[PDB]
Design an enzyme around this catalytic site. Structure first.
Site, PDB file in Angstrom:
ATOM      1  N   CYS C 150     -17.707  15.699   4.942  1.00 23.14           N
ATOM      2  CA  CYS C 150     -17.478  14.423   4.275  1.00 23.14           C
ATOM      3  C   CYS C 150     -18.375  14.316   3.053  1.00 23.14           C
ATOM      4  O   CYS C 150     -17.932  13.933   1.971  1.00 23.14           O
ATOM      5  CB  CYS C 150     -17.782  13.252   5.220  1.00 23.14           C
ATOM      6  SG  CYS C 150     -19.400  13.340   6.046  1.00 23.14           S
ATOM      7  N   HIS C 177     -26.664   8.109   5.070  1.00 26.28           N
ATOM      8  CA  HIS C 177     -25.486   8.249   5.909  1.00 26.28           C
ATOM      9  C   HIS C 177     -25.443   7.409   7.179  1.00 26.28           C
ATOM     10  O   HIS C 177     -26.458   7.205   7.836  1.00 26.28           O
ATOM     11  CB  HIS C 177     -25.393   9.744   6.247  1.00 26.28           C
ATOM     12  CG  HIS C 177     -24.033  10.217   6.649  1.00 26.28           C
ATOM     13  ND1 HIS C 177     -23.449   9.877   7.848  1.00 26.28           N
ATOM     14  CD2 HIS C 177     -23.170  11.061   6.035  1.00 26.28           C
ATOM     15  CE1 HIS C 177     -22.286  10.493   7.961  1.00 26.28           C
ATOM     16  NE2 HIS C 177     -22.094  11.219   6.873  1.00 26.28           N
TER      17      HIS C 177
END
Ligand SMILES: NC(=O)c1ccc[n+]([C@@H]2O[C@H](COP(=O)([O-])OP(=O)(O)OC[C@H]3O[C@@H](n4cnc5c(N)ncnc54)[C@H](O)[C@@H]3O)[C@@H](O)[C@H]2O)c1
Ligand SMILES: NC(=O)c1ccc[n+]([C@@H]2O[C@H](COP(=O)([O-])OP(=O)(O)OC[C@H]3O[C@@H](n4cnc5c(N)ncnc54)[C@H](O)[C@@H]3O)[C@@H](O)[C@H]2O)c1
Ligand SMILES: NC(=O)c1ccc[n+]([C@@H]2O[C@H](COP(=O)([O-])OP(=O)(O)OC[C@H]3O[C@@H](n4cnc5c(N)ncnc54)[C@H](O)[C@@H]3O)[C@@H](O)[C@H]2O)c1
Lengths: 333, 333, 333, 333
Positions: C150, C177
């Site tokens: 990602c 994150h």
């Protein structure tokens, strides 16, 4: 059909506006908020951490807040009696600032031309109503009314079904509630309510609430038979009611499930929901019900003593009920 | 005096170890955990997100875990029957892995040389005990016992005082509990308990618990008179019991406060605490009590129907009770 | 058009499935997961704490998972080589378990009848691709490929535009994150990566990541010019890239904004987004972009040294890219 | 030895008071705060969600706040010039309200008898100092000074060591910062800084900060060579600095570790810490260092471009520095 004005563009003010535009039951024509200017309103309405980006257009044009092409007159008055609601066509006014909850204070909107006022919070003296429970008791002579609180809107519908079928001798409620704007990010001042000043993200915070006692106001037969308290926990939205009650007539848990489900599919459809799924709070994010009975979460000790659980999106369900109440008021004109 | 072995060096395993070395009531001489090697144990014991850095010294020396200068033998066995407790000199074994809770599974430690096993959780068949409530019932013929759950250790002491003074006819409990190691960071698999697999940070999660019903095991007179459920909320530690009960004898709230305070200052000192301060969950972090009655948070509907609130550091209080229980067992050898 | 099988019904497995049905670019015909039986799959797919309830229909019927009326064959094999993908007609398989990332391990799906495998994670040896950056480098000779991570999918598109226009001399990336399934609710075992075992709700956790260096795999000219690290923080979803880089050709911040906006409206539309609004992480919940440049959040020290900010829904953006990649592969058959 | 008065009994005011009482460096003799009465001060000081209960004694006695047996005069003036510091014996005054940061406003305390004022925040015109970096530049002719910000106190010590040893050509900083009192629990009004009004529990929020630029004030040679921004994340305390810088002279990462470790064991002991342990934010809860270099978390791209990580308890470290600064000032009277 009825034109509405909204005082206070906070969580409730903004979500009532969203509900209005989504259901089309009422038309928002004016908004007043001395602390949020036009350009800032566009931003606050467009982006929402809890309910997502607005579905449609929202822009500032010629000094008006235009939502899906509908121009809304914007006011910035600190004093309610100075808002020109009448000039703007606002017949009903939603009082959602939280600081004008008494008949005397909320009535200030009438001086500006408004015809009726709906307080989106409990009132010490204004008549309180709960959709699906006693909204039919409303009549044209009432110019200032209250839609109670989110918690009362969750408990009342459930209590009505339980009381109607088995009779509630007495009950004690606990609501595990999401944090709200009145709380603090870190330990800070809250002189009148010390626990409420403690960091909201770090703590489970006990708090008083008259929501259960208030049920006796919308369901007269239960006056003095219910009360409770709350626990504020670190979630941004969605709360749950935990009702522990004694019943006068025998009630197997399966019987309770049957009557609640029957109520959710009939007279209380859209207000009281029913589920047997293994749900958790997020499953009710943006759910418009006032109360959703969680069959699997509750538990009975015996046929006369049980604990019933019901979920409620404290922001979304309530906001939709405010719109529903005004829609009902309009049909009575 | 008694030498102890710990199976499962987790939250409870490590905090029981921290509690043992602090009071010196028991001597930890061995630890087994196949998922944490010696050097890793040093780190996990030294740093703790919830209770802070260990106050003493902890290092790996000569293949042993050395805490405050005391060498501890480290085992890495998945099979309990294969642990050489005897050779390490461990007389009692704290079974805190959460996967060997039955008499049959927990009894495996005896094959390795242990003399007694204390399961750090409720057991389907092992005799359960709660310090301050029924620990005196223990006797040397019991080689495998359970210290119940954190929740039962919170409810039992309170229920004892309430029942002894006013008599509990029936009661329903709800515990708003901090998240634990069995939960998930984001929606994940939990085949046996679907709700428990949902994101722990995002949700209020209802869960079943036999903690209330279990009180009937430590207090026979309350068998079948109590039960309840739990709500897991987004906090890392500290939970609270919400007991809604009907009393036989009239009990004004002030009288409830008086008897609980008296109990906390006397026979239950250190187990049952009492406070009138405007506390929140964090005020009990690292608090060693099994249960602390919150006078201001509770509420009564009348003299026979009340909701009582009591806090408990689910990790710290319980861990200290495991040590207290072993100390009591040792006094009878 | 192409029939797809999904191995691993987790966050990515389920969201790739949701993306496949919502977008309708590919057709999911089979799912394999030994830890989630059919009835449980219905529940896990229907309710999602992060992305809300599925808007279509999902039910179990005759052993099939039926989504929007489409019957999906269900397998429960732990060994990839034993999954009979051919029996279901699955041509491409999305390997999203996180435990079969090598060519040899991922290739096990070909034995069961699958024709190509797309690993939903970086691979030590499988060719890696990022939609909008080097997906055109894919050709029919590749039976096993990787869609990277990602984070790489967020940084690569931005790096491409910045390098193409100004030239990146060197860059260091930090990604703040959201927590993931690999983390723990409270301090627990994580032998290979100690920091990752610490309580995810309580901590900001530093973590290594080869995501920035990996940009070189898809943009060879940047080999040796990029790297970075990550900080896991207490949010359930949506992350952000913070790229600090030195440019070859000096550029005013407004010029950087211009070229990125231009790219977002052109060749990278739907992959690289652009915004000047005062956004926060929640504004990207369920946003399908791989990367969205935040114009107002970035800051430049001078014309050759700047910090660029880009948001990414780590779950939703990536899952949609997996579907996009398969649609592209199908067009090359 | 010096007697001190504190204006603003908030996070910093209360923590500076705690630090003062456990070092003997200075003695608190007066506190002013209109929004917190005496009895409320006892509560706010004795309980702290972040740093735990106060372990000494604190009570309201004869109209004064008595901590560890030391009587403290309490004022409730909204206007600084009205506080009678002189009669109360307060020689230095810690200005921690956050609303009197300029030389002109902060000087109001001098009108009440105070001799010197220490602003616990950056000042537009008051000389700023960072302990261990430029505090030796203070002299007794300065009556009003600033102790900068928590972030500057974290970056400055590190930047000093890196610059003194390798020379910083230029650098960009990002601080992943815990939430503070200025943020909101749910989407609310923040007209001046729209992103800051968004829900603090739900979002990663980008925010501007002049902490990096301010380092150029305490370290003149770095004037105009540093800047950066911040990301507010859902944690109650402890933040981290992420400095990405270009070096004049070559420096292997191990060389950087060596010079930082050396600085931490010598000239910057107690100010700049050094660790190679696998730490996370919680490990710095109540840590008194201004900055703790995290050797394992950082990463180098090449000998002239590196990313350095340093932790800081934004509340506790800074509060201790305020006390350390006053102790230094006293030694120069
Ligand atoms: N945490 C609480 O609040 C709390 C309170 C009271 C009781 N408990 C009970 O205590 C027990 C442990 O709980 P916890 O929260 O410490 O869990 P945990 O997951 O933190 O600790 C379990 C430990 O057991 C280890 N383990 C797993 N299998 C093992 C094996 N086969 N042999 C040896 N060690 C093994 C794990 O590596 C881990 O370190 C459970 O039964 C739980 O229900 C927990
Ligand atoms: N979550 C994110 O934000 C994200 C983003 C990009 C890439 N990824 C990558 O995607 C992969 C999966 O991540 P996730 O977050 O969905 O994880 P997850 O834990 O949510 O899902 C993994 C699934 O695989 C299943 N599984 C385990 N072993 C299996 C087996 N032998 N056969 C079949 N199924 C099995 C599990 O039951 C689970 O449902 C990883 O490689 C990860 O690094 C994750
Ligand atoms: N909290 C941190 O992490 C941190 C770190 C370093 C510096 N700071 C700085 O310290 C200052 C205070 O921050 P805080 O986090 O303690 O805030 P806070 O909101 O917790 O405390 C501010 C206090 O000032 C009081 N106050 C307001 N007006 C007053 C007045 N006119 N007279 C006397 N008292 C008054 C308030 O009642 C409150 O208790 C700010 O300038 C801030 O930028 C904060």
């Amino acid at each position: 059909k009825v034109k509405v004005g909204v005082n206070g563009f906070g969580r409730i003010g903004r979500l009532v506006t969203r509900a209005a535009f989504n259901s089309g039951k009422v038309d928002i024509v004016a908004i007043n908020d001395p602390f949020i200017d036009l350009n800032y309103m566009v931003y606050m309405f467009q982006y929402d951490s809890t309910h997502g980006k607005f579905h449609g257009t929202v822009k500032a044009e010629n000094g008006k807040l235009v939502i899906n092409g509908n121009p809304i007159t914007i006011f910035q008055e600190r004093d309610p009696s100075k808002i020109k609601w009448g000039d703007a066509g606002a017949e009903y006014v939603v009082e959602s600032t939280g600081v004008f909850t008494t008949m005397e204070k909320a009535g200030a909107h009438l001086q500006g031309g408004a015809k009726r006022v709906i307080i989106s919070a409990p009132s010490a003296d204004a008549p309180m109503f709960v959709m699906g429970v006693n909204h039919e008791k409303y009549d044209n002579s009432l110019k200032i009314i209250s839609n109670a609180s989110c918690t009362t809107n969750c408990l009342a519908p459930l209590a009505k079904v339980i009381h109607d079928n088995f009779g509630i001798v007495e009950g004690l409620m606990t609501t595990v509630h999401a944090i709200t704007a009145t709380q603090k990010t870190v330990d800070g001042p809250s002189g009148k309510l010390w626990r409420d000043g403690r960091g909201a993200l770090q703590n489970i915070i006990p708090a008083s609430t008259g929501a259960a006692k208030a049920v006796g106001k919308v369901i007269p037969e239960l006056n003095g038979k219910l009360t409770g308290m709350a626990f504020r926990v670190p979630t941004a939205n969605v709360s749950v009611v935990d009702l522990t009650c004694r019943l006068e007539k025998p009630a197997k848990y399966d019987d309770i499930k049957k009557v609640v489900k029957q109520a959710s599919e009939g007279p209380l459809k859209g207000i009281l929901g029913y589920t047997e799924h293994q749900v958790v709070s997020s499953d009710f994010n943006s759910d418009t019900h006032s109360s959703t009975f969680d069959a699997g979460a509750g538990i009975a000790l015996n046929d006369h003593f049980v604990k019933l659980i019901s979920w409620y999106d404290n922001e979304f369900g309530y906001s939709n009920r405010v719109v529903d109440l005004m829609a009902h008021m309009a049909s009575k004109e």
